[PDB]
RNA sequence: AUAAUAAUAAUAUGGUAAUAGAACAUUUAAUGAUAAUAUAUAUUAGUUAUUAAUUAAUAUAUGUAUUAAUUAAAUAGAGAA
RNA sequence: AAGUAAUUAAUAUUAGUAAAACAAUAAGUUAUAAAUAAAUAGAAUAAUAUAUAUAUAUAAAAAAAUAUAUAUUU
RNA sequence: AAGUAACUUAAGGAUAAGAAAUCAACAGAGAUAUUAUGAGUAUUGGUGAGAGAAAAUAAUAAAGGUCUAAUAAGUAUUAU
């Protein structure tokens, strides 16, 4: 005979749903688990109600602001890149700076890189890779570990569109026959960050034109 | 000294015989991988696939009228007190005999459940493997592959009957007769059959139509787990089987 | 060559049909009655002395220009000098940074 | 195996073919499965009632 | 690259019913990314930790016995082999030890 | 190292509201032999630690079980208004 | 004649998959770091908290809390 | 609750919308519509109850751009 009339679920998968209002010996008899006679018996008191004491959520003071300008950043710890190399997963060539295009492509960080990647230092001891990295930013300790390894970090600015283009340049080419140009940092805070040598920002490390223009303006 | 003494490497290819259609004649072996055609028969996975498919299939046309849907007036039939009878509102109540249903379902009852794609693929493989084990998986081909024994003169390598549409002498036609002869030969007249084609074999389906109640001709894309398992013997094209394998292979 | 031209996107092809490259259209705003009147610029009507809006509104013009850039057919389109829009690499290079960027 | 099938009249399943590595093994299988059913038609395996005794 | 290889290149030992894989032997296939299928699992609301071992082909009982022999420090009781899916559950977070034991062969 | 049943010992096995576990009847869908020597239904008399099913006798239909069984769906069970 | 349906969120158990999953064109969601009102801060410089991470504070510390390191990542 | 019920009027096979004084952000995109995602997120609220986008990314979708106006003033705006 066909198997189709002898298939069961795996043991522990299914259950019988508790069926109310269906006789006394069932257990869930006349009252059907409701108790006896109150409001909840016939209706439902507000789930977050509290009788009269200030509804807790109101008792506590309101706290904080939602920094709309914030661009939360994902975290690719040094430990992970090491796991990829030892697993022979980080497939790079002499050079091929490990950017975010390669990063997500390789599968170290994956899912949704919306705003960028920060490189943190959770396996800085056993990190020994002389490859060059490039991300939104890195932790100071992580940077130091990279330097020790014989590597080279560069904090690179990416607007959300520019980041997207970096990650998936072929899509833009397919759509429009042209990948979009990478934007300059318009914001003051961004400019300041990438102008820091301590952060290994690209504007100082590559000696950018924007920074020079700003200096000229200041002079004049 | 020896850490895992009984470790070993599993077998990776099962031979399926490639046949000519009208008469199921062995032309070649073809080693299909063990994952497609000889997986361990996990019933739970198979069950999951079947139930999900059944749920997807659902029409869900149950439409009893609730007290709103039901078409009485909203008027109070007897005044609250001073009637000498029980309290009543409008005539639509579930409590009364002509009134609408309590907790009534409505139009388009959506019964669609979800399954992970990988699980579904595994189930598909599993069903195929079970069929192979049973001896109910007839792979028909020989066009692409290199043969051992040559194809017969009156058979052909694809899954189809010749000159089905031709009907000159009498109302009876040849493809139907051939099909009947085939059925007689392999002792599967009343048994459920499942012809998994690659491209639309119009002549084959015409031949089948007499035995439409038991024979189900399906494309490579539209074939289901249910269809495979219900079948008493599946007749799959080599190319179609390859395609299915490719579809439901675990990715690397 | 003809087949390659035909293979061009629709909007661009339509533009070429209705404003062909044999006519050297003006860089500056002109009379609306003129033959060399640029469809991207706002041309003045000679009687009323009112600036008519460009025959190709600004979005459409931009799209056309981007299409031309894609297929390398820029110079056959009439000039977009006096329309304020720049595009892509030229825009990037020629622009001055904002006062806020240079002088916070 | 094809020759054996042709002479026999019966079909040896694909899985079985894959498994059995010798002619002797094939013979043994045949003796086990097909032969008794051929001898006695009431003893044969029925599809609708697979757990018959 | 080809899903079904040609009849010539496939050896006899590669086929099913050869080399005796069913009788008292096993295999433990690595994941897609190429790691040992041994996982911590925090059941009953983080209260019950257990170590799960997946992707086992062949005789699971034998494999379990071999692992017990390798790791005598874990008790005999705490080795629940669920037969429907063929995976062997251990009570503690004994993942790393299991991995170490397996690595050498799988 | 498992299960099924059976052993010996001990401990427990009242119960409203309520929590948890496990079963059965009914109806539909998937798979599905069988046959008026049967099935379905009813009364009675039995048997099975027994809501149930089954034996027999009998009446009635029906040349027949969506039948046993596994799932999955329930408009799934009424001395309480 | 009466605990039901749709859209959510959470917990359990099982099954697949697994440092990935889902989905596969992309895009996204969840987890992969803890935080902090928030900012550019982020987990051993010689090993178990006597290390380090963030928050208060601060020259750096100590001090609260929470978190992180003991062949192979969770 | 809710611009919902209800009442009125009028038009067509549909109608409505539709070719940017739109979004955005120093990059850019290119009519409208419907759906998913963004996202119960920003925003908002006797800061209670509650209400809640857009960009962008995809689906759907058609030939989808196109002159008809001598270019638009009691209009832009503003105050209320």
How would you describe the overall organization of this protein?
- This is part of a larger assembly, with chains A (about 220 residues), B (about 250 residues), C (about 100 residues), D (about 55 residues) and E (about 110 residues).
- By secondary structure, chain A is mainly alpha-helical.
- In chain A, about 30% of the residues lie in helices and about 5% in strands.
- In chain A, strands 1-2-3 form a three-stranded parallel sheet.
- In chain A, helix 5 (about 160-165) crosses helix 6.
- Chain A is elongated, with a radius of gyration of 29 Å.
- Chain D has three helices and no strands.
- Chain E has about 110 residues and is an alpha+beta fold.
- Chain E has three helices and six strands; from the N terminus they run E-E-H-E-E-H-E-E-H.
- Chains in contact: A-B, A-C, A-E, B-D, B-E, D-E.
- The interface between A and B is small, with 9 and 14 residues.
- Chain A binds three RNA strands through strand 1, helix 2, helix 4, helix 5 and helix 7.
- Chain E: One of its GO terms (molecular function) is structural constituent of ribosome.
- Chain E: One of its GO terms (cellular component) is mitochondrion.
The shape of chain B, in one word, is elongated
Strand adjacency order, main sheet of chain B: 2-1-3-6-4-5
Largest interface: B-E, 34 and 34 residues
Task: Bin the helical content of chain A.
Answer: 25-40%
Helix/strand/pairing category of chain A: mainly alpha
Strand neighbour order, sheet with most strands of chain A: 1-2-3
The number of helical segments of chain B is 7
Protein name (chain D): Large ribosomal subunit protein mL50
Subcellular location (chain D): Mitochondrion
Family (chain D): Belongs to the mitochondrion-specific ribosomal protein mL50 family.
Organism (chain D): Saccharomyces cerevisiae (strain ATCC 204508 / S288c) (Baker's yeast)
Write the layout of secondary structure elements.
The structure is cut from a larger assembly and holds chains A (220 residues), B (252 residues), C (104 residues), D (53 residues) and E (106 residues).
Chain A (H helix, E strand, L loop, with lengths): L38 H4 L31 E2 L2 H9 L13 H7 L10 E3 L17 E2 L1 H10 L10 H8 L1 H8 L11 H7 L7 H4 L3 H11 L1
Parallel strand pairs in A: 1-2, 2-3
Chain C lengths: L1 H6 L2 H9 L39 H14 L16 H7 L4 H4 L2
Chain D lengths: L1 H7 L5 H6 L3 H17 L14
Chain A binds 3 RNA strands through β1, α2, α4, α5 and α7.
PDB class: ribosome
Keywords: Dextrose treated mitochondrial ribosome, ribosome
Entry title: Glucose treated mitochondrial ribosome of saccharomyces cerevisiae class I
